[PDB]
Design a binder for this molecule. Structure first.
Ligand SMILES: Cc1ccc(-c2cc(C(=O)O)c3c(c2)ncn3-c2ccccc2)c(Cl)c1
Ligand SMILES: [Zn+2]
Length: 345
Protein backbone atom coordinates (compact mmCIF):
# COMPACT_ATOMS: atom_id res chain seq x y z
CA UNK A 1 0.00 0.00 0.00
CA UNK A 2 1.65 3.18 1.26
CA UNK A 3 4.85 1.21 1.92
CA UNK A 4 5.28 0.87 -1.85
CA UNK A 5 4.81 4.64 -2.15
CA UNK A 6 7.31 5.32 0.63
CA UNK A 7 9.77 2.98 -1.11
CA UNK A 8 9.38 5.06 -4.30
CA UNK A 9 10.06 8.28 -2.38
CA UNK A 10 13.19 6.77 -0.79
CA UNK A 11 14.56 5.69 -4.18
CA UNK A 12 13.96 9.19 -5.61
CA UNK A 13 16.28 10.70 -2.98
CA UNK A 14 19.19 8.65 -4.37
CA UNK A 15 19.47 10.80 -7.51
CA UNK A 16 19.74 14.12 -5.63
CA UNK A 17 23.46 14.30 -6.43
CA UNK A 18 23.01 13.90 -10.19
CA UNK A 19 20.29 16.55 -10.12
CA UNK A 20 22.33 19.14 -8.23
CA UNK A 21 25.34 18.75 -10.53
CA UNK A 22 23.13 19.00 -13.62
CA UNK A 23 21.53 22.16 -12.18
CA UNK A 24 25.00 23.55 -11.55
CA UNK A 25 25.79 23.08 -15.24
CA UNK A 26 22.56 24.80 -16.29
CA UNK A 27 23.32 27.64 -13.87
CA UNK A 28 26.67 28.29 -15.56
CA UNK A 29 25.26 28.38 -19.09
CA UNK A 30 22.45 30.69 -18.00
CA UNK A 31 24.70 33.18 -16.21
CA UNK A 32 26.82 33.36 -19.35
CA UNK A 33 23.82 33.99 -21.59
CA UNK A 34 22.50 36.56 -19.11
CA UNK A 35 25.73 38.55 -19.52
CA UNK A 36 25.53 38.80 -23.32
CA UNK A 37 21.78 39.49 -23.47
CA UNK A 38 22.35 42.51 -21.21
CA UNK A 39 24.65 43.98 -23.88
CA UNK A 40 21.75 44.40 -26.29
CA UNK A 41 19.76 47.63 -26.02
CA UNK A 42 16.51 45.66 -26.26
CA UNK A 43 17.38 43.20 -23.46
CA UNK A 44 19.42 45.50 -21.18
CA UNK A 45 16.89 44.99 -18.41
CA UNK A 46 16.82 41.20 -18.69
CA UNK A 47 17.27 39.12 -15.55
CA UNK A 48 16.75 35.70 -14.06
CA UNK A 49 13.29 35.04 -12.66
CA UNK A 50 13.33 32.99 -9.45
CA UNK A 51 10.90 30.12 -10.16
CA UNK A 52 12.48 27.02 -8.57
CA UNK A 53 11.12 25.41 -5.40
CA UNK A 54 14.40 23.60 -4.63
CA UNK A 55 17.00 25.43 -6.74
CA UNK A 56 16.72 29.18 -7.19
CA UNK A 57 16.85 29.95 -10.91
CA UNK A 58 16.34 26.40 -12.21
CA UNK A 59 13.04 24.48 -12.26
CA UNK A 60 13.11 20.70 -12.75
CA UNK A 61 10.39 19.64 -15.19
CA UNK A 62 11.56 16.00 -15.65
CA UNK A 63 14.81 14.01 -15.27
CA UNK A 64 17.55 15.85 -17.21
CA UNK A 65 15.03 18.51 -18.32
CA UNK A 66 15.27 21.95 -16.70
CA UNK A 67 13.25 25.16 -16.98
CA UNK A 68 14.60 28.72 -16.75
CA UNK A 69 12.77 32.03 -17.22
CA UNK A 70 14.34 35.33 -18.26
CA UNK A 71 12.28 38.28 -17.09
CA UNK A 72 12.33 41.67 -18.81
CA UNK A 73 10.99 44.72 -16.99
CA UNK A 74 8.56 46.37 -19.45
CA UNK A 75 6.54 49.17 -17.80
CA UNK A 76 3.48 51.09 -19.02
CA UNK A 77 1.93 47.95 -20.51
CA UNK A 78 -1.67 47.70 -21.75
CA UNK A 79 -3.38 44.42 -22.60
CA UNK A 80 -5.94 43.42 -25.23
CA UNK A 81 -7.44 39.93 -24.96
CA UNK A 82 -7.16 37.82 -28.11
CA UNK A 83 -10.60 36.54 -29.22
CA UNK A 84 -11.94 35.58 -25.79
CA UNK A 85 -9.18 33.03 -25.13
CA UNK A 86 -8.85 34.40 -21.54
CA UNK A 87 -5.12 33.46 -21.47
CA UNK A 88 -3.75 35.08 -24.65
CA UNK A 89 -3.30 38.82 -25.14
CA UNK A 90 -1.95 41.47 -27.46
CA UNK A 91 0.61 43.70 -25.77
CA UNK A 92 0.54 47.48 -26.30
CA UNK A 93 2.07 50.36 -24.34
CA UNK A 94 10.85 52.65 -26.27
CA UNK A 95 13.83 50.32 -25.69
CA UNK A 96 11.57 47.65 -27.22
CA UNK A 97 10.22 49.94 -29.95
CA UNK A 98 12.14 47.86 -32.50
CA UNK A 99 9.64 45.02 -31.98
CA UNK A 100 6.49 47.06 -32.72
CA UNK A 101 4.07 46.25 -35.54
CA UNK A 102 1.58 49.09 -35.22
CA UNK A 103 0.58 49.62 -31.60
CA UNK A 104 1.28 45.92 -30.93
CA UNK A 105 4.49 44.45 -29.55
CA UNK A 106 5.30 41.44 -31.74
CA UNK A 107 5.95 38.22 -29.85
CA UNK A 108 7.51 36.66 -32.94
CA UNK A 109 9.88 39.58 -33.55
CA UNK A 110 11.15 39.72 -29.97
CA UNK A 111 11.47 35.94 -29.74
CA UNK A 112 13.48 35.98 -32.97
CA UNK A 113 16.10 38.41 -31.64
CA UNK A 114 16.18 36.53 -28.31
CA UNK A 115 16.79 33.24 -30.16
CA UNK A 116 19.43 34.79 -32.42
CA UNK A 117 21.49 36.28 -29.58
CA UNK A 118 21.46 32.98 -27.68
CA UNK A 119 22.29 30.93 -30.79
CA UNK A 120 25.30 33.18 -31.43
CA UNK A 121 26.50 32.90 -27.85
CA UNK A 122 26.47 29.14 -27.34
CA UNK A 123 29.07 28.85 -30.12
CA UNK A 124 31.77 30.79 -28.31
CA UNK A 125 32.30 29.24 -24.88
CA UNK A 126 34.07 25.91 -25.43
CA UNK A 127 34.00 25.18 -21.70
CA UNK A 128 30.93 22.97 -22.29
CA UNK A 129 29.13 21.74 -25.43
CA UNK A 130 25.72 23.38 -25.98
CA UNK A 131 23.44 23.16 -29.02
CA UNK A 132 19.98 24.55 -29.83
CA UNK A 133 17.08 22.15 -30.31
CA UNK A 134 13.93 22.89 -32.35
CA UNK A 135 6.96 29.40 -29.78
CA UNK A 136 7.52 29.02 -26.05
CA UNK A 137 10.04 27.98 -24.72
CA UNK A 138 12.10 30.33 -26.85
CA UNK A 139 15.21 28.17 -26.76
CA UNK A 140 15.87 24.58 -25.81
CA UNK A 141 19.55 23.90 -25.21
CA UNK A 142 21.15 20.47 -25.03
CA UNK A 143 24.21 20.44 -22.75
CA UNK A 144 26.74 17.61 -23.10
CA UNK A 145 24.29 15.55 -25.21
CA UNK A 146 22.44 14.79 -21.95
CA UNK A 147 20.91 17.78 -20.10
CA UNK A 148 18.22 19.89 -21.77
CA UNK A 149 17.15 23.35 -20.57
CA UNK A 150 14.12 25.30 -21.82
CA UNK A 151 14.69 29.07 -21.66
CA UNK A 152 11.59 31.29 -21.63
CA UNK A 153 11.55 35.05 -22.18
CA UNK A 154 8.92 36.80 -20.07
CA UNK A 155 7.69 40.38 -19.97
CA UNK A 156 7.19 41.49 -16.37
CA UNK A 157 4.13 43.61 -15.62
CA UNK A 158 3.72 45.20 -12.20
CA UNK A 159 0.05 46.05 -12.92
CA UNK A 160 -3.05 44.49 -11.39
CA UNK A 161 -3.79 41.03 -12.75
CA UNK A 162 -6.11 40.81 -15.78
CA UNK A 163 -9.81 40.27 -15.15
CA UNK A 164 -9.63 36.70 -16.45
CA UNK A 165 -7.82 35.81 -13.20
CA UNK A 166 -10.45 37.31 -10.92
CA UNK A 167 -11.92 33.91 -9.97
CA UNK A 168 -8.62 32.00 -10.13
CA UNK A 169 -6.04 31.19 -7.46
CA UNK A 170 -8.88 29.81 -5.34
CA UNK A 171 -6.85 29.44 -2.14
CA UNK A 172 -9.04 31.42 0.31
CA UNK A 173 -10.34 28.41 2.26
CA UNK A 174 -6.85 26.83 2.36
CA UNK A 175 -4.12 29.49 2.52
CA UNK A 176 -6.53 32.40 3.50
CA UNK A 177 -7.92 35.47 1.74
CA UNK A 178 -5.04 37.50 3.20
CA UNK A 179 -2.42 35.37 1.44
CA UNK A 180 -4.38 35.46 -1.83
CA UNK A 181 -4.47 39.28 -1.66
CA UNK A 182 -0.72 39.43 -1.01
CA UNK A 183 0.08 37.06 -3.86
CA UNK A 184 -2.10 39.03 -6.28
CA UNK A 185 0.02 42.10 -5.48
CA UNK A 186 3.08 40.44 -7.03
CA UNK A 187 3.87 41.05 -10.72
CA UNK A 188 2.59 38.84 -13.49
CA UNK A 189 4.35 37.71 -16.65
CA UNK A 190 3.61 37.37 -20.36
CA UNK A 191 5.40 34.74 -22.44
CA UNK A 192 5.30 34.47 -26.24
CA UNK A 193 3.39 31.20 -26.33
CA UNK A 194 1.32 31.79 -29.45
CA UNK A 195 -2.40 30.95 -29.56
CA UNK A 196 1.72 35.14 -34.31
CA UNK A 197 1.51 38.26 -32.14
CA UNK A 198 -0.10 36.86 -28.96
CA UNK A 199 1.41 36.48 -25.49
CA UNK A 200 0.23 34.15 -22.72
CA UNK A 201 -0.28 35.09 -19.06
CA UNK A 202 2.20 33.28 -16.84
CA UNK A 203 2.14 32.75 -13.10
CA UNK A 204 4.81 30.05 -12.84
CA UNK A 205 6.71 32.20 -10.31
CA UNK A 206 3.90 31.74 -7.78
CA UNK A 207 4.55 28.01 -7.43
CA UNK A 208 7.57 28.37 -5.13
CA UNK A 209 5.59 30.82 -2.94
CA UNK A 210 2.98 28.13 -2.23
CA UNK A 211 4.74 24.78 -2.50
CA UNK A 212 7.17 25.71 0.31
CA UNK A 213 4.51 27.52 2.34
CA UNK A 214 1.76 25.01 1.76
CA UNK A 215 -0.15 24.46 5.01
CA UNK A 216 -3.22 25.96 6.55
CA UNK A 217 -0.91 26.20 9.54
CA UNK A 218 1.89 28.71 9.09
CA UNK A 219 4.22 26.16 10.76
CA UNK A 220 3.20 23.18 8.60
CA UNK A 221 6.35 21.03 8.11
CA UNK A 222 8.43 23.39 10.32
CA UNK A 223 8.42 21.04 13.33
CA UNK A 224 8.04 17.36 14.16
CA UNK A 225 4.40 17.76 15.25
CA UNK A 226 3.17 19.12 11.89
CA UNK A 227 4.35 16.77 9.12
CA UNK A 228 2.08 16.62 6.07
CA UNK A 229 2.43 14.68 2.83
CA UNK A 230 1.56 17.42 0.30
CA UNK A 231 5.02 17.65 -1.30
CA UNK A 232 5.40 13.86 -1.44
CA UNK A 233 2.03 13.45 -3.17
CA UNK A 234 3.09 15.96 -5.81
CA UNK A 235 6.41 14.12 -6.28
CA UNK A 236 4.58 10.81 -6.66
CA UNK A 237 2.15 12.27 -9.22
CA UNK A 238 5.03 13.64 -11.28
CA UNK A 239 6.82 10.31 -11.08
CA UNK A 240 3.68 8.41 -12.10
CA UNK A 241 3.49 10.47 -15.30
CA UNK A 242 7.24 10.28 -16.02
CA UNK A 243 7.15 6.49 -15.76
CA UNK A 244 4.03 6.12 -17.90
CA UNK A 245 5.55 8.37 -20.57
CA UNK A 246 8.70 6.25 -20.65
CA UNK A 247 6.81 2.97 -20.88
CA UNK A 248 4.61 4.28 -23.71
CA UNK A 249 7.61 5.68 -25.59
CA UNK A 250 7.26 3.27 -28.54
CA UNK A 251 4.26 5.17 -29.94
CA UNK A 252 4.67 8.40 -27.90
CA UNK A 253 0.96 8.42 -27.04
CA UNK A 254 1.63 10.60 -23.98
CA UNK A 255 3.97 13.21 -25.50
CA UNK A 256 1.51 16.07 -24.94
CA UNK A 257 1.20 15.58 -21.16
CA UNK A 258 3.68 17.24 -18.81
CA UNK A 259 4.40 17.93 -15.15
CA UNK A 260 2.53 21.23 -15.58
CA UNK A 261 -0.71 19.25 -15.98
CA UNK A 262 0.16 17.16 -12.92
CA UNK A 263 0.97 20.21 -10.79
CA UNK A 264 -2.24 21.99 -11.80
CA UNK A 265 -4.36 18.99 -10.85
CA UNK A 266 -2.44 18.62 -7.58
CA UNK A 267 -3.05 22.24 -6.52
CA UNK A 268 -6.75 21.85 -7.32
CA UNK A 269 -6.75 18.93 -4.85
CA UNK A 270 -5.11 21.21 -2.27
CA UNK A 271 -8.02 23.63 -2.76
CA UNK A 272 -10.53 20.80 -2.28
CA UNK A 273 -8.75 19.48 0.85
CA UNK A 274 -7.75 22.65 2.70
CA UNK A 275 -7.06 21.24 6.19
CA UNK A 276 -3.60 19.99 7.21
CA UNK A 277 -5.38 17.01 8.86
CA UNK A 278 -6.40 15.93 5.32
CA UNK A 279 -2.68 15.51 4.48
CA UNK A 280 -1.40 13.62 7.50
CA UNK A 281 1.78 11.73 6.67
CA UNK A 282 0.20 8.53 8.03
CA UNK A 283 -2.41 8.88 5.27
CA UNK A 284 0.00 9.02 2.30
CA UNK A 285 -1.74 6.19 0.45
CA UNK A 286 -5.19 7.77 0.68
CA UNK A 287 -3.89 11.27 -0.06
CA UNK A 288 -2.12 9.98 -3.18
CA UNK A 289 -5.32 8.20 -4.24
CA UNK A 290 -7.22 11.47 -3.81
CA UNK A 291 -4.71 13.10 -6.16
CA UNK A 292 -4.79 10.36 -8.78
CA UNK A 293 -8.59 10.11 -8.74
CA UNK A 294 -8.91 13.84 -9.41
CA UNK A 295 -6.36 13.66 -12.25
CA UNK A 296 -8.31 10.72 -13.71
CA UNK A 297 -11.51 12.73 -13.56
CA UNK A 298 -9.86 15.63 -15.39
CA UNK A 299 -8.68 13.20 -18.05
CA UNK A 300 -12.08 11.51 -18.51
CA UNK A 301 -14.00 14.80 -18.59
CA UNK A 302 -11.27 16.40 -20.76
CA UNK A 303 -11.26 19.38 -18.40
CA UNK A 304 -8.34 20.76 -16.38
CA UNK A 305 -8.75 24.42 -15.45
CA UNK A 306 -5.72 26.68 -15.44
CA UNK A 307 -5.08 27.34 -11.75
CA UNK A 308 -5.09 31.10 -12.35
CA UNK A 309 -7.46 31.40 -15.34
CA UNK A 310 -10.50 29.18 -14.64
CA UNK A 311 -12.05 29.59 -18.11
CA UNK A 312 -8.84 28.37 -19.76
CA UNK A 313 -9.04 24.58 -20.16
CA UNK A 314 -5.56 23.00 -20.28
CA UNK A 315 -7.21 19.83 -21.65
CA UNK A 316 -9.20 21.43 -24.48
CA UNK A 317 -9.25 19.84 -27.93
CA UNK A 318 -7.35 22.89 -29.15
CA UNK A 319 -4.47 21.92 -26.83
CA UNK A 320 -4.56 18.10 -26.53
CA UNK A 321 -6.36 15.78 -28.92
CA UNK A 322 -9.18 13.54 -27.74
CA UNK A 323 -7.36 10.28 -28.45
CA UNK A 324 -4.42 11.21 -26.19
CA UNK A 325 -6.78 12.06 -23.32
CA UNK A 326 -8.79 8.85 -23.81
CA UNK A 327 -5.55 6.86 -23.85
CA UNK A 328 -4.09 8.28 -20.62
CA UNK A 329 -7.48 8.01 -18.91
CA UNK A 330 -7.33 4.26 -19.53
CA UNK A 331 -3.76 3.89 -18.24
CA UNK A 332 -4.32 5.95 -15.08
CA UNK A 333 -7.50 3.98 -14.30
CA UNK A 334 -5.53 0.76 -14.70
CA UNK A 335 -2.69 1.94 -12.45
CA UNK A 336 -5.08 3.21 -9.78
CA UNK A 337 -7.29 0.10 -9.83
CA UNK A 338 -4.24 -2.18 -9.50
CA UNK A 339 -2.27 -0.44 -6.72
CA UNK A 340 0.18 1.18 -9.20
CA UNK A 341 2.17 -1.69 -10.73
CA UNK A 342 4.19 0.96 -12.57
CA UNK A 343 5.84 1.52 -9.14
CA UNK A 344 6.84 -2.16 -8.75
CA UNK A 345 10.50 -3.11 -8.36
C1 LIG B 1 -0.10 27.22 -7.01
C2 LIG B 1 0.45 27.27 -8.42
C3 LIG B 1 1.37 28.25 -8.80
C4 LIG B 1 1.88 28.30 -10.09
C5 LIG B 1 1.51 27.34 -11.04
C6 LIG B 1 2.02 27.39 -12.43
C7 LIG B 1 1.43 28.24 -13.36
C8 LIG B 1 1.86 28.29 -14.69
C9 LIG B 1 1.13 29.24 -15.59
O1 LIG B 1 0.78 28.92 -16.71
O2 LIG B 1 0.83 30.39 -15.09
C10 LIG B 1 2.90 27.43 -15.10
C11 LIG B 1 3.48 26.54 -14.18
C12 LIG B 1 3.03 26.53 -12.85
N1 LIG B 1 4.47 25.78 -14.79
C13 LIG B 1 4.49 26.20 -16.04
N2 LIG B 1 3.57 27.17 -16.31
C14 LIG B 1 3.37 27.80 -17.59
C15 LIG B 1 3.82 29.09 -17.81
C16 LIG B 1 3.63 29.69 -19.04
C17 LIG B 1 2.99 29.00 -20.06
C18 LIG B 1 2.54 27.71 -19.84
C19 LIG B 1 2.72 27.10 -18.61
C20 LIG B 1 0.57 26.38 -10.65
CL1 LIG B 1 0.03 25.17 -11.78
C21 LIG B 1 0.05 26.34 -9.37
ZN1 LIG C 1 3.35 20.51 5.39
Amino acid sequence: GASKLRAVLEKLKLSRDDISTAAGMVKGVVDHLLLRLKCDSAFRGVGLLNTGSYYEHVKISAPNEFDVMFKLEVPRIQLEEYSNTRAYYFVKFNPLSQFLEGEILSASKMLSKFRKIIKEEINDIKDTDVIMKRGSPAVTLLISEKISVDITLALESKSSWPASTQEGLRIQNWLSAKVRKQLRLKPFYLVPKHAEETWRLSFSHIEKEILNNHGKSKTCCENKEEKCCRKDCLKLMKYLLEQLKERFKDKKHLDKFSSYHVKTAFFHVCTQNPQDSQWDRKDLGLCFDNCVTYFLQCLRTEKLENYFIPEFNLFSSNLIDKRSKEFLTKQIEYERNNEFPVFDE
